[PDB]
Design a protein around this ligand. Structure first.
Ligand SMILES: Nc1ncnc2c1ncn2[C@@H]1O[C@H](CSCC[C@H](N)C(=O)O)[C@@H](O)[C@H]1O
Ligand SMILES: Nc1ncnc2c1ncn2[C@@H]1O[C@H](CSCC[C@H](N)C(=O)O)[C@@H](O)[C@H]1O
Ligand SMILES: Cn1cnc2c1c(=O)[nH]c(=O)n2C
Ligand SMILES: Cn1cnc2c1c(=O)[nH]c(=O)n2C
Lengths: 348, 348
């Protein structure tokens, strides 16, 4: 998937929003960075070296950089490495850099050349940076993507991942894959961090106490509609497996403590409404448009993988079922994407 | 030009060749890198940090990385930053990285993750890297490009740059621009280098003793043909000025010594035949094809700037005149691109 997985190049950019997860991350990001400067890590007041792991493209890429930069300058050279898979749309980010830099100088006074933005492409499940070279690593909404479909060909009937309705051997196969992946992530990136360096990670979580469908759940139920309706053969659904896990906070916690590289400074979950990134009639129109927006966001996350497995002909039917499902969920008051945020410091 | 200048995205890749300049650079590159390891710069045996300034795209980008990597490993983590202007075709380099990395491991044994290739886009006339962070900076065939058209609207009649036929106020305007630009280059990048760090630079030079037309000279004479022939109004030629200088070695030497940041370790010129990158009938066919190749290479360097000034309609006529001119030059035995190579060490 290293050379297959990426967000939609409509686009992830057009459908993304600061208002979904990044605004919840921001205060925690801010506190993390301020604590780092106060900790006086070697060279941090000369050059603050930061990586954004799974930056994608679009406004969110720039919004995350802005948040970092403003956090650092809140009342040092900044070297930012943007990381994503080798077929991410880097060219478009780089073309927006000249205006980004000017706007940075008009906004903050940050002289041009004092914030140095480059890219380091590759999988965050492999080494990206020299040993003990980085102060801070940030990733938002990436770590639920696995390095591969769980290494357990086997039939996950009526399901596309370890959903609540999936059988326990599937659930165990997906957990074991996440464990491998996340342990590797932690082992590798701890080595890249300067002593007492930090990571701030935000990704999908599963909460036993709630019952809120995540984007994969909305997708799964919508593919199911289509087989029931007759539009898709049951074999297409039975063969489709997404390389994505939704962990519990206890699972996240056990993995980190097992790895041993990091102390947990902060660990919380939060629930983001589906349409938090949506802006504005009767009211059936209002809710139609909100549901249609949700479906666009969900299509923008999964289209590459959906097109390779199913072909392009079912995607408009799929978008239609996702919207219908989205609206029913929001009406029941369970229309939230559940997310965990965890702040880690490298142990001496 | 920071946001306008770039090589042709036919393409610079298809028309480029290791055999033109890089094979001449290679032995000097090799000696430079070996001397660096022996000098024991801080951290160099942990992580060797290298920048390629004006990497472009195509085989040459990868050939330069390969040469660096093989030089380092000749009987350490390697972090390579590829730099070019913000609208360079980075996406295509990154997409070739997965196979590059595998081929690196099949060739050398270089484990994956021990050579870390990223990008730092921007003008090399501004800061690219944190202070005292780099061991070695390499640039081949870039530094003759100026930051702007010489800051001397004024009419350069019948000429496109400071050619031998250009009047002395033009020559002085172009030299003064190169002086500003190259001095800035040196001041800025010296600051980025770790103590006793080095630069290896290769670019076009002008030699009083020879009389060999460079690619701009071939272009200039070919645009002149077209005005004489009637295909182009003299005003189009009189208004066209390329942001490019061809310095003498004495001019290069004076600038470096004036700047004061660098000691010169090595300084030589070499003359590269026009068709050194060309592979294979009577013989008028052979020489036709060799001349046509030269014209393609010349079009691939200048098409973006030619299209913006002249429009697209004259380019096939232009390619035809460049080939005719190329063949006459080669036949006289003066068909060489004259180049200088200079090795610099940061003074204590
Ligand atoms: N192993 C991996 N290495 C690098 N990037 C990965 C990855 N697995 C998933 N991703 C990236 O994770 C991103 C998820 S979308 C999140 C993007 C950004 N952090 C934001 O807030 O909008 C995608 O761009 C995808 O390509
Ligand atoms: N100010 C500048 N900053 C960064 N790159 C520049 C530049 N001025 C010119 N260049 C780059 O110089 C390159 C010249 S072609 C040389 C490319 C490569 N070194 C090789 O051996 O093939 C172009 O890609 C162009 O975009
Ligand atoms: C709702 N939403 C918004 N962005 C995302 C999601 C998601 O569910 N998974 C996911 O991977 N990403 C990037
Ligand atoms: C002959 N040749 C091959 N490559 C180049 C040239 C040149 O003349 N200028 C120039 O800038 N570049 C990149």
């Amino acid at each position: 998937l290293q050379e297959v997985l990426h967000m939609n190049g409509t686009s992830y950019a057009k459908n993304s929003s600061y208002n979904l997860f990044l605004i919840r991350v921001k205060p925690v990001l801010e506190q993390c960075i301020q604590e780092l400067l106060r900790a006086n890590l070697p060279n941090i007041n000369k050059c603050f070296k930061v990586g954004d792991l799974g930056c994608a493209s679009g406004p969110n890429t720039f919004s995350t950089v802005r948040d970092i930069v403003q956090s650092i300058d809140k009342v040092p050279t900044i070297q930012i490495f943007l990381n994503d898979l080798f077929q991410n749309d880097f060219n478009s980010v780089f073309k927006l850099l000249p205006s980004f830099y000017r706007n940075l100088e008009k906004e903050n006074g940050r002289k041009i050349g004092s914030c140095l933005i480059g890219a380091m492409p590759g999988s965050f499940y492999s080494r990206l940076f020299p040993e003990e070279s980085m102060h801070f690593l940030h990733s938002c909404y990436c770590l639920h993507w696995l390095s591969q479909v769980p290494s357990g060909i086997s039939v996950n009937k009526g399901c596309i991942y370890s959903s609540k309705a999936s059988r326990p051997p599937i659930q165990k196969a997906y957990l074991d894959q996440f464990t491998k992946d996340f342990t590797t992530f932690l082992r590798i990136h701890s080595e890249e961090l300067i002593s007492r360096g930090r990571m701030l990670l935000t990704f999908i979580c599963k909460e036993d106490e709630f019952d809120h469908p995540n984007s994969m759940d909305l997708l799964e139920m919508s593919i199911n509609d289509l087989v029931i309706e007759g539009h898709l053969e049951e074999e297409k659904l039975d063969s489709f497996n997404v390389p994505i896990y939704a962990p519990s906070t206890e699972e996240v916690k056990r993995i980190v403590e097992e790895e041993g590289s990091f102390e947990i400074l902060y660990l919380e979950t939060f629930n983001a409404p589906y349409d938090a990134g949506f802006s504005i009639s009767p009211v059936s129109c209002d809710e139609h448009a909100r549901a249609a927006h949700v479906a666009s966001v969900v299509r923008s996350i999964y289209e590459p993988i959906l097109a390779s497995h199913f072909g392009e002909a079912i995607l408009p039917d799929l978008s239609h079922r996702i919207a219908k499902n989205a609206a029913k969920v929001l009406r029941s008051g369970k229309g939230f994407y559940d997310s965990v945020i965890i702040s880690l410091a490298k142990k001496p």
